[PDB]
């Protein structure tokens, strides 16, 4: 198994609610944490995979940990609603990751974005050249829907890394009739 | 068809829930 | 409504070990903690008190870090030593605030009644007081705006 | 249901822009640039024909899609009462859609500020003081939506139009300067309401320090397109007696409910004639004899007792006064509102009281020196 702490956010922001896949965006979410909490809960029992979030705040409610169930507890109620943002997810996810345990892993981010999120592009090419410059490999996944022609996410994926990146990839989703194991399986390939 | 699916949540609460008056009762009746 | 309260200089002298700590662990400057004890009464006392490994980013400086194994199980043993000493608030050096201060007391006002931010004082040479409380307010303005939460100069004593 | 929006998809010229594009909003199965849709036709300069339509497939939005906050639902009924202009049946669907649409957010507010503001049409004060005053029983966890604040003021206000609370349109006026505190609506409206605030503060005594935030933007923004004496009268209870053609002109030209108590607002020259004369004049001679009071406070001998015991009831000053020699002796007061020139000029106070009780200190400690011991 590769070393890396794998830091989850949930997207609990106000475009993964309606009823276009199944009647619930909240299960393609779930499930999505279920099959990588229980993929690294399988892969490595020195994790540390918690919850972060990114509507209006970066809550981290539990403890960074190598245990899911309670984290799978609190996917129940999750609220899909409010101020999605990339950026401050990343950078707390960043110096989160710094407070880790004895350094047996790297920095890995999934962030799940179903908005066509609100960030400059010197935003993500200021924070994904900090991710150059602070070695760090991120899987960046669509949920829900993005916008056509993806910006943010896309030029994240374009920015990243090298020197040991080619972690920076993107699976974009679009809003049609399709079930939530299949847009979690086409972002489970290449996050 | 959804009261079912918050009642449900409410019972795996439930279930978590008694699992903490189990534990406030049974792990403080340790101590 | 809180005048004053009874400060034990023990868990201050925790906050010097403290300050002993972030001179050696790194680029962590100012001394954060969270702070133990019981209201009584709009006089108080603090025993106890616990100081954070916390850090906090000068670009957005609303990132807390107030971590739950940190939290919980050692609140687990604070509890365990005592039932009565459990939380009140919370801490941290300089004089003025840090933009984060609010958010950190919204994080333990589910866990008290009025969890006070009392901000301390490491390197005393003050012309007024020493470390003073600031309890939950809703002052907001005549406006009918939403609420306002910055917490107040609600005097305190040692 | 496609073909119901098939068979009313043109409406107007230059209408189907949106509709060219709606016929496929639904196919995308999307609900928050649907929910900007039905945004998009309250922008969209429709006669309500559409909605009273559509809100057959809104009640079909509460069947299947139930998770959109029904904020553009109340928003779409309180647009297709364009077309109904009759609220008796769309409060029975308002508070239907209510109860049967859920969401976790403060559902209610939105809701009984609706029934507020259609409840104009109630014949008010029967059904008012219940769900107007419910809104602020429930104001009290969040008010971060703060336009349902802006209804609540709505509703406030409109109450206050139900009659007996004369200058809480002040402080309720107030709840509207901060409602939304960017106008977000052009000037000549508001100013209106700039008039008619001054007017309605004006008139109505509940309040004493009334000329208190005349400085405030986004009132006197309003008011530089005001008649031009509407703010000197206002100024003439800020400064507080001394524009005699101002508290005058009061009688002058503002002619409706003035004479009711313009002997009250000419005692508010007087009881704020006391802070002027205290202030003004901060030293001594503060057993002030009654000449300035019966000479400039339009007052006679026999009443300056009444304009002090009124001002016993008022309680911001409480002097001693004397009545061997009927000198009207100035004690303890509230001062005055702002004197920016006085709070750059107060040095010659404050900086006076530094170095001279310092100065004075250091003369204490320098003769007390040599017992340092």
Partial sequence: MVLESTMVCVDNSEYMRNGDFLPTRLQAQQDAVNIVCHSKTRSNPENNVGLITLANDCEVLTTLTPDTGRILSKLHTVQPKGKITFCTGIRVAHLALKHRQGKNHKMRIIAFVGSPVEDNEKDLVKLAKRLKKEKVNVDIINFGEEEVNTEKLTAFVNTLNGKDGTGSHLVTVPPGPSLADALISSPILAG | RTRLLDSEIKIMKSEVLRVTHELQAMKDKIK | AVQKVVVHPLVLLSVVDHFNRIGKVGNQKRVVGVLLGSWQKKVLDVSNSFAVPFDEDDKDDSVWFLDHDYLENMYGMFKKVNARERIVGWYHTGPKLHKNDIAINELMKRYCPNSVLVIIDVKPKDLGLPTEAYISVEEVHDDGTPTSKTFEHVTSEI | ?373
């Fill in chain 4, 1 to 373: 249901v496609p073909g119901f929006l098939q068979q009313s998809q043109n409406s107007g010229p230059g209408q189907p822009a949106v509709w060219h594009r709606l016929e496929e909003l639904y196919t995308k199965k999307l609900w928050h640039q649907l929910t900007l849709q039905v945004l998009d036709f309250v922008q969209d300069p429709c006669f309500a024909q559409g909605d009273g339509l559509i809100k057959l497939y809104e009640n079909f939005i509460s069947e299947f899609e139930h998770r959109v906050n029904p904020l553009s639902l109340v928003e779409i009924i309180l647009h297709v009462v364009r077309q109904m202009t009759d609220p008796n049946v769309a409060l029975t669907f308002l508070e239907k859609t209510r109860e049967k649409v859920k969401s976790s957010d403060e559902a209610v507010i939105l809701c009984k500020t609706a029934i507020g503001a259609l409840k104009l049409n109630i014949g008010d004060l029967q059904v008012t003081k219940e769900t107007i005053e419910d809104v602020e029983e429930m104001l009290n966890n969040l008010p971060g939506v703060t336009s349902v604040h802006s209804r609540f003021y709505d509703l406030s206000s409109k109450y206050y139009q139900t009659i007996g609370n004369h200058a809480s349109y002040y402080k309720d006026a107030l709840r509207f300067l901060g409602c939304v505190d960017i106008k977000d609506l052009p000037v000549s409206e508001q100013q209106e309401r700039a008039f008619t605030l001054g007017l309605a503060g004006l008139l109505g005594e509940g309040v004493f320090n009334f000329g208190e935030l005349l400085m405030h933007p986004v009132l006197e923004s309003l008011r530089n397109t005001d008649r031009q004496w509407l703010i000197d009268t206002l100024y003439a209870f800020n400064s507080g007696n001394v524009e005699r053609f101002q508290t005058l002109k009061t009688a002058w030209g503002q002619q409706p409910d003035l004479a009711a108590n313009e002997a009250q607002l000419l005692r508010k020259i007087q009881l704020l004639c006391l802070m002027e004369m205290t202030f003004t004049r901060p030293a001594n001679h503060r057993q002030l004899t009654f000449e300035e009071i019966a000479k400039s406070a339009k007052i006679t001998v026999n009443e300056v007792e009444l304009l002090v015991m009124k001002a016993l009831s008022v309680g911001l000053v409480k002097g001693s006064i004397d009545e061997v020699d009927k000198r009207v002796h100035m004690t303890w007061v509230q001062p005055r509102v702002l004197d920016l020139q006085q709070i750059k000029g107060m040095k010659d106070r404050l900086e006076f009281w530094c170095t001279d009780v310092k100065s004075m200190e250091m003369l204490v400690e320098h003769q007390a020196h040599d017992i340092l011991t």
